[PDB]
Design a protein around this ligand. Structure first.
Ligand code: MG
Length: 580
DNA sequence: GCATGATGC
DNA sequence: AGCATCATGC
């Protein structure tokens, strides 16, 4: 039974009501400078479909879009906000975003269209987007009659679903999470994405040029040491050369064949000169394919800017993800790749890159939630926690902890945050399970509060059905009751880790909101460019650096008050690389 | 389409 | 070993 609506040829006052479900359709997955395919409005006066050329050309409609007192309910308002920024139009008054509401209620649903969100509440009078647009080569906007009905049905679903979603969020104590954290953050992310990050493409091409020389040399060498040529990127090919031709030990059997994972090659290095070369070629190869070629593919030719899209409704812990390009996984560990960062520069003359990062926020969050006296005292003294953990588990004074002891204690700290298991630690440290179990037992002896939290959080997940973070984000863990040990253990690890990684996500998100408000009050020209889990990257006039040095760390450190202090380090320079 | 293996925090 | 995205091979 088709849905009734007015396919309007011009905007009417009836369509500019104080509250409405609004759909501003952008079908292209990447909405940056993308077309707005159609518009639907549903309010007390009825259901309307508007052609974009006509609506966005109408001063009253545009004014209505920008009037913050006219409330709109939408699904993925950030997509609309950004598509509109590229057209010079401001969207204001979004009081409810169904995508974010669905995500908070249950991140696992994987809700990515109005249909999926509506199904959560047994509402199925709307089609999935893929059903009407198709996928890939078949993706396409349908003719007006079909397009118009789909947008109206989506707007109708949003109009109908807003109350039940808000009611459940309030029952979950997530009402403020949506209205005071995620929705305001959505606007900040739209600004970041729209601003983009300037790329020195010439520097990138230079690098790409040199990289190509090195790759050839390492490749030729590999063929030499191999006795002949083969596809170094072909797993099969590599495995035959390594384990058959060269007779290297197979101390890790892949499904049916051999493993050439990094740690395995790392273990075989001692046996043959070719292994070191293979790992280096993989290193350089990743730089070339993803951080040079792949990057250059998404840089805008006119402005030389890259505009990522932060997916705010994807991760199971509350973190953001970044795509096209992923600006959250730019190399930094190895110097060769870290240089890629020299290509990320300020967007204006005489501006600089400013980077601020939390120091051990996960462990500090753990100290707070576990209320472990020893861990809390360590952060109160601002000690190096890895040296401190080594001192405690290996029972030695600071003077006697060796580099090897610190390295292993650090690995224990990682395991504790990830959700500890003797096998996971054994694998990471390349030791036996019993030895790893011993390290863990000694850890819990020194940090009994943490031990109690890990036991308690697992029982709680079992009792309630989910775990939560500081700001009430939640994650259901059905598998925690599974009778399969491996399946149950993965859930137990999630129970242990989620509240830590998730609360750290909550904190930095609130810091971003607090920071922008401070930035605005001060009328500073500085603005956010990126967020990479526990760090914020901005660019600003060189004349604002001194102010930023005091402002950013303070806002980040004060975003939330924990039982231990929060500490933020910062650096700035002429490129992202120099912001160290 | 999925596995493998790289990158980040 | 927790959470992610991208390029490649088959
Ligand atoms: Mg850090």
């Amino acid at each position: 039974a088709a849905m009734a609506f007015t396919l309007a040829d011009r905007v009417t006052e009836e369509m500019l009501a104080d509250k409405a479900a609004l759909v501003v359709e952008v079908v292209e997955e990447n909405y940056h400078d993308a077309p707005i395919v159609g518009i639907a409005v549903v309010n007390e006066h009825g259901r309307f479909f508007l052609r974009p050329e006509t609506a966005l050309a109408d001063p009253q409609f545009v004014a209505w879009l920008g009037d913050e007192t006219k409330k709109k309910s939408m699904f993925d308002s950030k997509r609309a906000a950004v598509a509109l920024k590229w057209k010079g139009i401001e969207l204001c008054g979004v009081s409810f975003d169904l995508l974010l509401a669905a995500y908070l209620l249950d991140p696992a649903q994987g809700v990515d269209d109005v249909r999926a969100a509506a199904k959560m509440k047994q509402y199925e009078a709307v089609r999935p987007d893929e059903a009407v647009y198709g996928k890939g080569a078949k993706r396409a906007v349908p003719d007006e009659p079909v397009l118009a009905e789909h947008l109206v049905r989506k707007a109708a679903a949003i109009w109908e679903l807003e109350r039940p979603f808000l009611d459940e969020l309030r029952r979950n104590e997530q009402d403020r999470l949506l209205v005071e954290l995620e929705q305001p953050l959505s606007s900040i992310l739209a600004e970041m994405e729209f601003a983009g990050v300037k790329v020195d493409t010439k520097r990138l091409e230079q690098m790409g040029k040199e990289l190509a020389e090195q790759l050839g040399t390492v490749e030729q060498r590999i063929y030499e040491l191999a006795g002949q040529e083969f596809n170094i990127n072909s797993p099969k090919q590599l495995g035959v050369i390594l384990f058959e031709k060269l007779q290297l030990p197979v101390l890790k059997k892949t499904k049916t064949g051999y493993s050439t994972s990094a740690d395995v090659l790392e273990k075989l290095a001692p046996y043959h000169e070719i292994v070191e070369n293979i790992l280096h070629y993989r290193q350089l190869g990743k730089l070339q394919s993803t951080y040079i070629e792949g990057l250059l593919k998404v840089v805008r030719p006119d402005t030389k800017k890259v505009h990522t899209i932060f997916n705010q409704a994807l991760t199971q812990t509350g973190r953001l993800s970044s795509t096209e390009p992923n600006l959250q996984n730019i190399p930094i560990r190895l110097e060769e790749g870290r240089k890629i960062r020299q290509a990320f520069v300020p967007s204006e003359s005489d501006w600089l890159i400013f980077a601020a990062d939390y120091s051990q926020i996960e462990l500090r969050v753990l100290a707070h939630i576990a209320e472990d006296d020893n861990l809390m005292e360590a952060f109160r003294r601002d000690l190096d926690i890895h040296t401190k953990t080594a001192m405690d588990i290996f029972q030695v004074s600071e003077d006697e902890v060796t580099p090897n002891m610190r390295r292993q204690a650090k690995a224990v700290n990682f395991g504790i945050v990830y959700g500890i298991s003797d096998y996971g630690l054994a694998q990471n440290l390349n030791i036996s399970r019993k030895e790893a179990a011993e390290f863990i037992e000694r850890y819990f002896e020194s940090f009994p509060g943490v031990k109690r939290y890990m036991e308690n959080i697992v029982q709680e997940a079992k009792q309630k059905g989910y775990v939560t973070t500081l700001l009430h984000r939640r994650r259901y863990l059905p598998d925690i009751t599974s009778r399969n040990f491996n399946v149950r253990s993965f859930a137990e690890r999630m129970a242990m880790n989620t509240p830590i990684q998730g609360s750290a996500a909550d904190i930095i998100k609130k810091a971003m909101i607090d920071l922008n408000a401070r930035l605005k009050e001060e009328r500073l020209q500085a603005h956010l460019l990126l967020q990479v889990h526990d760090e914020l990257i901005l660019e600003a006039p060189k004349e604002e650096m001194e102010r930023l040095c005091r402002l950013v760390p303070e806002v980040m450190e004060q975003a939330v008050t924990l039982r231990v202090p929060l500490k933020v380090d910062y650096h700035y320079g002429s490129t992202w690389y120099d912001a160290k």
